[PDB]
Design a protein around this ligand. Sequence first.
Ligand SMILES: *[C@@H]1O[C@H](CO)[C@@H](O)[C@H](O)[C@H]1NC(C)=O
Ligand SMILES: *[C@@H]1O[C@H](CO)[C@@H](O)[C@H](O)[C@H]1NC(C)=O
Lengths: 54, 114
Amino acid sequence: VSSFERFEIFPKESSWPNHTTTGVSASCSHNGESSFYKNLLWLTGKNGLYPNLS
Amino acid sequence: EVQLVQSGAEVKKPGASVKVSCKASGYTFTDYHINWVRQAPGQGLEWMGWIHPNSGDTNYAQKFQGWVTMTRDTAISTAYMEVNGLKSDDTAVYYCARGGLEPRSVDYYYYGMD
Ligand SMILES: *[C@@H]1O[C@H](CO)[C@@H](O)[C@H](O)[C@H]1NC(C)=O
Ligand SMILES: *[C@@H]1O[C@H](CO)[C@@H](O)[C@H](O)[C@H]1NC(C)=O
């Protein structure tokens, strides 16, 4: 690669107001404490709702 | 302080129906499930179902599918459990519960009963 910059395309907040972004798994544990990928988000329902997103 | 206050005792004859009430206070009534669990005399706990006040989505146990109807209101922060076609073995104590134990992992993503 000649040039390469990591940028936050969909910020954890502001981008998913009506979904839950906190999802983590024990299969991706950092320091024996469940975590998840640093470049992806697990979207889940907020308050019994997973509204259609675009 | 979170609190669930249920309706008063009921005496019915077989075939009749009941509608038990569960009014919530101390939290936003729409954030968490309302579970329904019964306990017959001397025996253990038997889970009946849940209803999520915000969406209205329902999860009925298998034994109770069709015989039971769970509803809400949201305006008065109340959930309802209607039982139909009652029978002597339906004599029991009916508890409601709040699904406020938010899950820690998406492996076991279950709202436990606070
Ligand atoms: C989230 O829900 C609110 C409710 O009024 C709505 O105004 C907003 O546009 C929604 N945002 C997204 C990204 O769906
Ligand atoms: C998503 O689209 C489906 C199909 O029309 C609709 O039934 C549902 O209500 C929509 N949900 C939201 C949150 O808009």
